[PDB]
Amino acid sequence: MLPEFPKIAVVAGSEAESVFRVVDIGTGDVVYEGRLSDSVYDDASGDTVRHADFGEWKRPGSYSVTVGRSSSAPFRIGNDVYRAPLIQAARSYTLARAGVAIDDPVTGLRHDVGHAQDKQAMLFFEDPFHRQGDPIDVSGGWYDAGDYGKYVPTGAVAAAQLMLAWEMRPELWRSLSLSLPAGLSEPERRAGLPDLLVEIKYELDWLLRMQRPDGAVYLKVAGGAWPGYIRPEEDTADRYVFGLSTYGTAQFAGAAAMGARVYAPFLPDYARKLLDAAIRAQRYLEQHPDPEFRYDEGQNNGSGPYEKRTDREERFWAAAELLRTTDDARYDAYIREHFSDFLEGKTSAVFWGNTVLLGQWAYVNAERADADHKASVRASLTAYADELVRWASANGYRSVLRPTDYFWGSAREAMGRAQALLLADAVAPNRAYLETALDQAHWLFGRNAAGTSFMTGIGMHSPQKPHHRLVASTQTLIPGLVVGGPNAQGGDPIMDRLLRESDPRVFPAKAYVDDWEAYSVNEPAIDYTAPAVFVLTRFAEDR
Template structure:
């Protein structure tokens, strides 16, 4: 699931700086929490380690700097410490010439991310310790935000002077500056999208001083979200129906056995009476006490809300009970891909208010990075995520998930369903949409070898129809040129083979084109048994073995050819670790071994011994997964350390592997296995509002759904908001140290400039389509 090396583009003092970032998913512990008080944590701008930074000066002044993450930054002084922490040294010198100089230091979050000071503002402060070399040193302090939906995107507050708060001496002193002084009330400054903290020159003096333990603080407590969490879309008639009632123990005035009622929204009449059941007195993922309100026996379709007989507990948001709760979500989640299309104008007839011109028309005549091959047309395909990159292996994963949704449940998908330009051609719209990406993948082929180039490089931050920067087909790795990574060939071969099965009924010629390209991709893998390393950049997969297995299984399913069967049988037992139930990341880019098994079991004549082996391994994997779904605090299978980038996608991916594995082994629908059906429903409940944040993580789906998404396209397009159906990546404890969360499941920020928690990606939305389709099978 990890997209490493993701480019982040940021501006500092009218400069554009392109920074490379690496997302770390492993090697970090989940946030610690205790069952006592719940104060807002200190947000560490600089403590023992630093976040990103830029420092510079102008004549006649100079500022001592050292390189850090590709930028000039202040030296970290481990000799000048205070309270056991190092300091930042600000050593300003002058060449003595005339004129008024300047110096400036920009302190940012890790990877130049935005963060929120909303809960800190009323009673919070910027705090730091300071010591001067001579005494009397002075400087200014200011802040900047970043909001792509506003003009100007970046707004800087007026600077305040340090001398109003401290007279610097040669001894360490503590300084506390109220946030209301830094950011005046009524300012257009967006407290939910804080970007930069500035220290700058107040005079033309040479001076030296040290700053230590820079942080934002507040004496306030962290507050609970609204207490009653429901699936904001609703529940199928025969589904398990529950709400979770949760909050900090000192705020939630409910106990085991507190009465609740489900009421009709139309007339407030009572449809169900029940009692809360304590689930967890202290949950480490949220820091909260959790109760369950179960109303599964309420079967009558209608719109309802929940009322709890406890002081201070407001009624829930409304929700539906019905037989078609998930059908609108399937449509919205699938229409997401139309909005992600490259190479087409989004017109009002199909996009409503979300129109734009042709995105990156230059892709129709793109050069290779090496210059070794002629320019070619690599238009079409989907923008992968929040950036403008187009990647073969991640696109293949998304296509695969859409293909599985259609092939398992074709009755859920029809022509004229998604209002696409292709609607009305007698092909289900979901296949028309997949074809937009498949055509791009086909264009990334090397005809001579059968291999596939990895990506069309992402570019700048202008709107897609305004970004005229050169985009390249990346084929360079160090001194190597014309690089066609084998993981891309394996992924493409698998997805093309799967898709050929779907198109055979509607367009046999196109299905044959897909299958021929898949076979040629396999030929390339055979010719390169030791693999071809990836080019630098996102989704660079060095170990292609899992995706080779996927390609073999998908091709065997599509063709029945013995060579693919032999490869699978010779290698499948090497992937027993894929069924280690203690881990909660069943698959994704570069790791599609589990899907390989599902494909193989769908083939016409799977080997009986392989099937039996898989049945045993799957049963062992399924047991802890179901246990986490049934007994985990939020019923999402995620463990405390699983809240990393893309955690929502992981929660959904786990469920579709569980469900499809059950289907291909048992040959029955989800109504035949109540536990699996409930697990799928529970994952959707979590995504759609039954989570500690009380948020639906899908734009436009529910009364408290997310309102923004990290998207270079939509953030710079000038539209008010984003289309319905965009899934955010979800809580993330690893990549943004200035998020004001103390527990894993709350490390989330809904804004348009934070990729760590609020980015979209094509394979996550494909997960959403597939899981919503699975949930829709329960009437």
């Protein structure tokens, strides 16, 4: 917990108690005694919960909350408390790199070069630039999740969210070491690039390799079958380039246009390479206005589908990010002609299937965007943020999730909503936005009905058996990874059995188990961790 922010312990049950005591563990002295709030039933969990509010106690230290016969696990009040998880989450991307050997003394993660054969991955179909089966260098980038596939939509959206974390607090990140393992990114490190930007560039370099000469971008790199729980160097099967999509082409353009701005102070040639690539993608999109999602039979036999057959929110982001980076007012005209609805509303949390908020954020920060339309976008952001505050303020776990939000990726959604609250705070400062965003980090780290952190390596309870082939094959804890979170819709054989056999039925906020095969709730992904990095950036102490 931070000294200057709200402090509530959430207690499920304990209906009969009326007071609580905050005890300094080092002295045994009570530093704060108060009355518990009234018990209130929580629809998503089935829990009856109340609060111990001790926000006025601000002294750093280690404490426990006593209620009746029980005392909480120790917790910290301190200014420094979110720096370590931020660092862990950010450097988890390094440990997810494809195409390199890793020997990390921090975690002990060690593996030989994985997927070197991505340097000659075979195109799964014929296109105007390559025969079916022709090799393409699509090496590098990050493994997506617990598998070894590499997918443009989540790679672009994750890279963009990490770049927005950079832009939120560049001076924090300039002095933040990710303890990059030996041999990695040696030219970038010799050049003094901040470690976060070194890591993001590994993914941008790969995204650039997924673009064809006409500007369009392929969908993903993977094999024809899912590997077992094996080290990446053991996954020697042929690799393929699959798919072609307009929404992924637009997401690439958004990420590359953002990277052009972010990298320009450091690497003028690389920044211009990114911008030219972004504009080639945008020009492909302007010349091919209809959505496309290419599907060849078999392309999902060994990798996730990431299918979206419309693309408006992503085309909007591409154009708005280009507007922000280039200051070319022709992009404002284009946006106003085709995407006026996104200038007047429809804010929703960022994820790979809807980047409208990345576009809205670019637009409101664009010097050459129309002023009245920037005002409209700010109001869309604050209306959405106000709704999140209303929900969370009345929720016993101070959660921005409703019972119907417990589907695949709920933990991402909590942190994406927290991200939206912080973007709203940037355009229209409001302490409630900042506090509610921080409440979602409290939730993520275990203040929730499932009684577990959804970030590895953090919390009294955390995921120990994430559906993750590197963790499983090396039996090595990688901290800072965010798993999907509770999901009442099923999707893997463990959760499917739990949900169908349970009587009474599982409450949605508890639809979670820590098991290797529970991949509908317990698989980490780069686009789950990315909004958590963004949110923690705001609350990490600088030095």
